[PDB]
Amino acid sequence: LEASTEIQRELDAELDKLKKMYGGDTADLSKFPSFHFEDPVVDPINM
């Protein structure tokens, strides 16, 4: 209610900084993220 411009600017700057820090630009963090199991290649048992 009747907030000043500088407080709104600082809020937007902090929200953008946290979104970039927490990686919110890549995907929406408010939802459940999906995961992929990186398919494993074991060491060669044979020579």
Partner: protein, 53 residues
């Protein structure tokens, strides 16, 4: 020389038995590596959930 040759054949047979132990340790190590990769993906999921919170 004949007695030493007999004992060396016995050592060769024991080497074959320990080769069986090697193959069992090989399949155990593969299961250990697969389970450890499962633990890392569980850790990665929990870390992502903590990051969302």
């Amino acid at each position: 020389g004949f007695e030493e040759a007999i004992t060396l054949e016995e050592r060769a047979q024991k080497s074959a038995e320990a080769q069986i132990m090697l193959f069992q340790a090989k399949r155990e190590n593969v299961q250990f590596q697969l389970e450890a990769a499962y633990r890392a993906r569980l850790h990665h999921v929990n870390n992502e959930i903590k990051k969302r919170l």
